[PDB]
C-alpha cells in the first residue's frame, strides 16, 4: 500500500503553472508515479513533454526540493528502455545533472550521480556522451578525500557503481584518456571495507580488462592483481564473481601478465573455485585454467605443483557439459605445451577415462579437442616407448570402442584424427 497518485493530466496542469508550490506538488506526484511499484507510466510522462521541464527544474538552484524531485523522476525515466533513456538525453538532462554533482546538498548530488549512472549504463554511445560533457572530473573530485569512510555508505556505493558504468561496454571501448584518469581512484576503492564497493570496483576492473592486451596492461601496471586475488578468496559471491572475471580476463593476455596472477597466489584458491557450488563459477574458473595451461612449461609446472590437475580431472568427470568443454580445452593446452614428464603425471592423475567418456558427446568441437589431447599424449608415449602401455589403458577405459565409432560420423578432422590413431597405435584384429 502501495497506491494513491494523480492523473498525468493534473501533474501537467501543475507544472505548467507559474506558482512554485504547484510545480513542486506536481513534480512530487510525478516522482510518486514513476517510483510506484509498479508499471509506472513512463511513456505517458514523456508524451506530456515533461522531460524538458524536469531538466529545467534541475537548474532551479533557488529551490532544492524541486531539484531533488525532478532528479528522482528523471532517474526513474532513465532507468527504463533505451528509447526512454534517450528521451532524457535529448531533453538535455546530462549537462544539467553534472552541474548538480557539486551541490552543497549531498542527497541531490547523490541523485545526480545515480542518474548519470543509468544514462552511461545504457551503452557505449551514451557513456561517451557523459564523458564528453566532462562528468569524470566532478565525479572523481567527490572521491578526492583523504579518508573515504567519511562519505555516506549509499553515497560511496552509488559513485563506485556509476564509475563502473563509465568503464562498461565495448564497440567502442571507453577512451584511454578516461580509463587512465579513473584507474587511480578505482585502485583505492578496491581496498575499501564495504562489500558492495568491492563488488562494483571488481566489475569496473573486469570491464577494463575485457579487451586487447594493451588495455590489460593499463590495469595490471597499477599493481591491482594481488588485491584481485585477495578478493578472489572472498566468501561472498558478489565479490568473487567479478574478481574471477577480472583475473580471467588478465590471463587471456600475455605469458608475462599471466605470471603476475600466479605470483599473486591465485592458484592456491582455485581448488575452491573449480569445486564451487555455483556452476557459473566453475565454468569461469575452468576457462581461466585453460588459458593458463596455454602458457609456458614453467607455468604449467606451477599448476602441477599447486595440485590443480586432480581438480581439473574432477571437473572433466563430474561437471555440466559446458564446464566439461572448458576442462577439455585446459587439458589439450596442457598436453600441447607440457613436457613429457608433465604429461606422464597427467596420465597418473587418471585423465584417460574421463577424457574418453566425453568422446561420446554430441558436440563436434569438444571431440576434436579431445582427439588432439589423445594424440599429444601418444606423442609423449613414443618418446618413452610406452605406446603399448597407453594403448592398453585406453581399451581398459572403453575408450577404443569410442574411437572406433568415430571412424564414421560427419566432419573431416575426426576422420583422419581417429584413423591415424588406430593405424599408429591399435589396428590389427578387433572386428570386421
Amino acid at each position: 500500500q502501495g497506491t494513491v497518485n494523480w492523473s498525468v493530466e493534473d501533474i501537467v496542469k501543475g507544472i505548467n503553472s507559474n506558482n512554485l508550490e504547484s510545480q513542486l506538488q506536481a513534480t512530487q506526484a510525478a516522482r510518486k508515479l514513476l517510483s510506484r511499484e509498479k508499471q509506472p507510466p513512463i511513456d505517458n510522462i514523456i508524451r506530456a513533454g515533461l522531460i524538458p521541464k524536469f531538466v529545467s527544474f534541475l537548474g532551479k538552484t533557488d529551490c532544492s526540493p524541486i531539484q531533488f524531485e525532478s532528479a528522482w523522476a528523471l532517474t526513474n525515466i532513465a532507468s527504463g528502455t533505451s528509447e526512454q533513456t534517450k528521451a532524457v538525453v535529448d531533453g538535455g538532462a546530462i549537462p544539467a545533472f553534472i552541474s548538480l554533482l557539486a551541490s552543497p546538498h549531498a542527497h541531490i548530488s547523490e541523485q545526480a550521480v545515480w542518474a548519470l549512472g543509468n544514462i552511461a549504463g545504457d551503452g557505449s554511445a551514451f557513456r561517451d556522451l557523459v564523458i564528453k560533457h566532462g562528468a569524470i572530473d566532478p565525479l572523481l573530485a567527490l572521491l578526492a578525500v583523504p579518508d573515504l569512510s567519511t562519505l555516506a555508505c549509499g553515497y560511496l556505493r552509488n559513485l563506485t557503481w556509476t564509475l563502473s558504468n563509465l568503464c562498461r561496454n565495448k564497440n567502442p571501448a571507453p577512451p584511454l584518456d578516461a580509463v587512465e584518469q579513473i584507474l587511480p581512484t578505482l585502485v583505492r576503492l578496491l581496498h575499501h571495507n564495504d562489500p558492495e564497493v568491492l563488488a562494483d570496483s571488481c566489475w569496473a576492473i573486469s570491464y577494463l580488462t575485457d579487451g586487447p592486451n594493451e588495455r590489460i596492461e593499463m590495469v595490471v601496471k597499477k599493481g591491482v592483481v594481488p588485491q584481485l586475488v585477495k578478493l578472489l578468496g572472498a566468501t561472498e559471491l558478489p565479490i568473487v564473481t567479478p574478481a574471477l572475471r577480472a583475473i580471467g580476463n588478465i590471463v587471456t593476455g600475455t605469458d608475462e601478465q599471466t605470471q603476475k596472477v600466479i605470483d599473486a597466489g591465485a592458484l592456491a584458491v582455485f581448488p575452491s573455485l573449480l569445486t564451487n557450488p555455483k556452476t557459473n563459477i566453475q565454468k569461469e574458473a575452468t576457462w581461466t585454467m585453460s588459458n593458463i595451461t596455454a602458457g609456458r612449461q614453467d607455468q604449467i609446472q606451477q599448476v602441477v605443483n599447486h595440485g590443480l590437475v586432480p581438480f581439473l580431472v574432477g571437473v572433466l568427470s563430474k561437471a555440466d557439459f559446458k564446464t566439461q568443454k572448458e576442462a577439455a580445452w585446459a587439458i589439450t593446452n596442457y598436453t600441447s605445451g607440457g613436457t613429457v614428464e608433465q604429461i606422464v603425471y597427467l596420465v597418473h592423475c587418471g585423465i584417460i577415462e574421463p577424457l574418453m567418456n566425453l568422446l561420446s558427446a554430441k558436440d563436434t568441437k569438444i571431440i576434436q579437442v579431445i582427439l588432439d589431447a589423445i594424440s599429444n599424449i601418444f606423442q609423449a608415449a613414443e618418446k618413452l616407448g610406452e605406446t603399448e602401455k597407453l594403448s592398453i589403458m585406453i581399451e581398459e577405459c572403453g575408450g577404443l570402442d569410442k574411437i572406433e565409432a568415430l571412424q564414421r560420423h560427419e566432419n573431416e578432422s575426426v576422420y583422419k584424427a581417429s584413423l591415424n590413431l588406430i593405424e599408429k597405435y591399435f589396428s590389427v584384429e578387433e572386428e570386421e
Binding site: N76, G80, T85, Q111, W114, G121, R245, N280
Partner: peptide
Amino acid sequence: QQRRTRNGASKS
C-alpha cells in the same frame, strides 16, 4: 555475450 547483468537501477 556472457551474462551476469546489472546496468540500470531504478530508485523506489
